[PDB]
Design a binder for this molecule. Structure first.
Ligand code: 3P5
Length: 377
């Protein structure tokens, strides 16, 4: 019965993916951003320039105030509001209704995006990182406890304006090709995993694998880019520059500031290398890899003028909070958040990218010794 959830996600490039939900009685329709990088379910509950609509607690008869404030600071943007509970459902999802915690956003800063089409956020990560504290039961946890929906979900994020699917309670075998490869969830807070090796164009970066996960590595559908720790980022950029030394790009480009352009349909994809991230496997000394094509870390953006040339932005940025595998990584892959078995699965998506002589992939099995030492402590 997962077919009903296929294609239940929409959104704009770089503005996140959202699914339709309803809260309160009678049901109030809202587009909620799907974010595996947080654990708070929050929605606008007051007027805002970027909000076409919002949650009105007054009109909901099933609303319950918790008389307790709350705020959440993201890497970029933040909001604060009032806690409470109410009935929630997902039209294009499982046919159920659960009472979940809801943070009514009353004030925010750089959180809502102008014209994103969503008015809330659904944090699918664990309680450990929920605000104010890990006692605020996350939405998915409530769903699993109050219904018979299996403890897992999968995400198929498709690029291009953008669409995808969020299969709640299972895996839809029609959304991916090949085999699914699983990596352990190291700890249940963020969806933390362990990168044991990195290669660019088949060339190993040869860095202490601890650097790849300093201070952690997470799968964040709520982040657009692939964010890398300072040292790793520098090495990656240096390698990518050399691979594309044929052409010249402004230094601001490698910082995600300036967008490079090329004649409509003349993008030199070949000069850009593929990036391979090896992840910890499910058995001793075993790992697997996911390969990313340039069409993934070169997010396309509208021409800065009236020109009709292909312009893109470097979707790989530096991080100070660990590696972040955002949409640019997830796009083209079918990702299974198998909470019940503490693992995350990856498979080539049915809506993957298309390069002439190259292809995004998930390959295994590989042998990698001392993977344990790759985790940071
Ligand atoms: O770039 S982010 O801030 C986008 C954010 C979700 C978000 C928020 C506002 C937006 O317009 C968009 Br688009 C997306 C994620 O949720 C973050 N996930 C990691 C994280 C980083 C710092 C603090 C937290 C606290 C747990 C929530 C989580 C990464």
């Amino acid at each position: 019965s997962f077919v009903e959830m296929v294609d239940n996600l929409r959104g704009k490039s770089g503005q996140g993916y959202y699914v339709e939900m309803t809260v309160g009685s009678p049901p109030q329709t809202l587009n909620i951003l799907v974010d595996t990088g947080s654990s708070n379910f929050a929605v606008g509950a007051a007027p805002h320039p970027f909000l076409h609509r919002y949650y009105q607690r007054q009109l909901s008869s099933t609303y319950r105030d918790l008389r307790k404030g709350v705020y959440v600071p993201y890497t970029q943007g933040k909001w604060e509001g009032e806690l409470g509970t109410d009935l929630v459902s997902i039209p294009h999802g499982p046919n159920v209704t659960v009472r979940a915690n809801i943070a009514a956003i009353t004030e925010s800063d750089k959180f809502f995006i102008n014209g994103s089409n969503w008015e809330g956020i659904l944090g699918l990560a664990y309680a450990e990182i929920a605000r104010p504290d890990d006692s605020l039961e996350p939405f998915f946890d409530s769903l699993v406890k109050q219904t018979h929906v299996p403890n897992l979900f999968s995400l198929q994020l498709c690029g291009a304006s953008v669409g995808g699917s969020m299969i709640i309670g299972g895996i839809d075998h029609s959304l991916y090709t090949g085999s699914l490869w699983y990596t352990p969830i190291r700890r249940e807070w963020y969806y933390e995993v362990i990168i044991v090796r990195v290669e660019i164009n088949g060339q190993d970066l040869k860095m202490d694998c601890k650097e790849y996960n300093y201070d952690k590595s997470i799968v964040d559908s709520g982040t657009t880019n692939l964010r890398l720790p300072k040292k790793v980022f520098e090495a990656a950029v240096k390698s990518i520059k050399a691979a594309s030394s044929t052409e010249k790009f402004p230094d601001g480009f490698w910082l995600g500031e300036q967008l490079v352009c090329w004649q409509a349909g003349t993008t030199p994809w070949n000069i850009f290398p593929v990036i391979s991230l090896y992840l910890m496997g499910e058995v001793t000394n075993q790992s697997f890899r996911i390969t990313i094509l340039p069409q993934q870390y070169l997010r396309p953006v509208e021409d800065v003028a009236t020109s009709q040339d292909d312009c893109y932005k470097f979707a790989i940025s530096q991080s100070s909070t660990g590696t972040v595998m955002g949409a640019v990584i997830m796009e083209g892959f079918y990702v299974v958040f198998d909470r019940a078995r503490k693992r995350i699965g990856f498979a080539v998506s049915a809506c993957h990218v298309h390069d002439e002589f190259r292809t995004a992939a998930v390959e295994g099995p590989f042998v990698t010794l001392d993977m344990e030492d790759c985790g940071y402590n």
